[model samples]
Structures are given as structure tokens and as C-alpha cells.
Target: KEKKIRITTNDGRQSMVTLKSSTTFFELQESIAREFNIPPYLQCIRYGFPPKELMPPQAGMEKEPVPLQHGDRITIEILKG
Candidate 1:
């Protein structure tokens, strides 16, 4: 199944993306990067208010699904390093 979610960058800019229930954080990062016209390599996505960060695997830039609901908020922090 697929659902829509909102992504908010640290700059407070927001955008929408549709995702499958089994989607990975890497994919989410790509969606975010596309929405903001930034490089996927330069983004760090987080889950909620306090911003629990989601990091992609070093061996491969993929990850497992995270339970999500419609209108979920993903925080994007740009890579500084």
C-alpha cells in the first residue's frame, strides 16, 4: 500500500511525497531531495519533534520500512560533513 507524507526541512520548507508502506529511508531521502532540489547525499531525515535521525546503511543506501501514517512529518537536515 501507499500513503502520502509531508517532509519539512530544517529551513522550515515543506513538501509532499507518496510512498509505499515498504519503502526505505533512502527512498524518502531521494523524494525529499527532489522536492527541494538538493542532493540526496546531503540530507539527513528524521522522524518527529525531537528529530530522531534516520541514517542509511554505509554498505548500501537502503533501509527497512518505518511505520507511517498519512500526513507524517519527516524532518530534513542537510549534511554538514
Candidate 2:
């Protein structure tokens, strides 16, 4: 059974997301976008921590439609300001 998790956004908004434990970090991207009222088509999210080596993963510069276990970052920046 998929259990729901509650995430409190930077703007004090609460979103309840349901997913299986097997769900990857990439899958959560869609749900997060909805919570922030941002469209994924305008992909502009970045992670905080640097890559683990001199050579970073190829997908690092791109927006992933699927989630990665290590790439589950839950922050977004409002570029409209």
C-alpha cells in the first residue's frame, strides 16, 4: 500500500503526497511542481550539494522527468519575481 507523506513547503504550504517506498526521487518532481503552482515545462530547479566526483552525472544539467534516489531535492525558486 502506498502511504502518504506530508511536506511543508518554504512558503508554509502543506502538501500531502502519496507514493510507494519504491518510488524514485524523479517521480516526485511532478507532484512538487503542482504544490508550488509551477509548471514542469518551465524546468528550473537545482540541487544544493555538489556532485560526488570530478565527473558529474550526465543528467545533472537536465531536468529529469523521473526521480533518482540521490536526487530527491524538495526546494523551488520563484523566478517570476
Candidate 3:
């Protein structure tokens, strides 16, 4: 199923990203990179009130599914290089 995810940047920019329920956090970063031109490695994606950071799979770990719902709002904090 397709989901419309609301995106907010640390700099106060906002946009929407369309993703699937099957999408993973790693893939979400890629999608955001395409939409905002922010690097995947530099993105700290968060969700919910007092949002918690979403973590991608690490070596020897299973890929975690994206905790997203239709019309859900997520904030992306770009890491300073």
C-alpha cells in the first residue's frame, strides 16, 4: 500500500514523500535524498511527538520496517558535515 509521509526538516522546510509499507529506513533515507538533495548518511529521520530517531539495519542485523502510516508526519534532522 502507498503512504503519503509528511516531511519536516530541521531548517523548517516541509514536503511530502510517497513510500510503501514495505519500505525500510535505509530506503527511506534514499527517498528523502532524492526529494531534498540531502545525503542519506547525513539524515537523521525521526517520527512521533518528541520524535525518536529511526535507525537503519546494521551488519548482522535484520532490516527494520519503516514505522509509517498514511499521512504520517516525520522530521529529518540533517547532520552537519
Per-candidate TM-scores read: 0.78, 0.43, 0.86
Q: Which model is ahead, 2 or 3, in terms of lDDT? A: 3
Which digits, one per residue and each the tens of the lDDT, describe model 3 over residues 1-81? 588888878977877888777778887888888778689988889997889898887764436558887879899989986
Tell how far residue 56 is off in model 3, in angstroms.
Answer: 1.5
Give per-residue lDDT, candidate 2, residue 64.
30
lDDT of each: 0.74, 0.44, 0.82
Model 2 alpha-carbon drift over 4 Å, by segment: 39-81
After TM-score superposition, the amount by which residue 11's alpha carbon in candidate 2 deviates from its true location, in angstroms, is: 1.7
Residue 60 displacement (Å), model 2: 13
Order the candidates by lDDT, highest first — what do you get? Answer: 3, 1, 2
Tens-digit per-residue lDDT, 1-81, candidate 2: 654544434454555566345543444545557666755443234443552211112465333333333314434433453
Q: Largest lDDT belongs to which candidate? A: 3
Candidate 2, residue 38: Cα displacement in angstroms equals 2.9
The clash count for each model shown is: 0, 5, 0
Question: Which lDDT value does model 1 have at 47?
Answer: 87
Q: How far off is residue 40 in model 2, in Å? A: 5.0
Per TM-score, the best of the predicted structures is: 3
